[PDB]
């Protein structure tokens, strides 16, 4: 999660903060 913070580790592929969820289309944890 990227509660404050941005996600810095699944963003790398694409999974953008989503609601401080990464998320790439479907999510990838953190």
Same mark, same amino acid.
């Given at each position: 999660?990227? %509660?404050?913070?941005?996600? &810095? %580790? &699944? ?7 989503? =609601?401080? %969820?990464?998320? =790439? ?6």
């Amino acid at each position: 999660s990227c %509660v404050y913070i941005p996600c &810095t %580790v &699944t963003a790398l592929l694409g999974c953008s903060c989503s =609601n401080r %969820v990464c998320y =790439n289309g479907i999510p990838c944890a953190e």
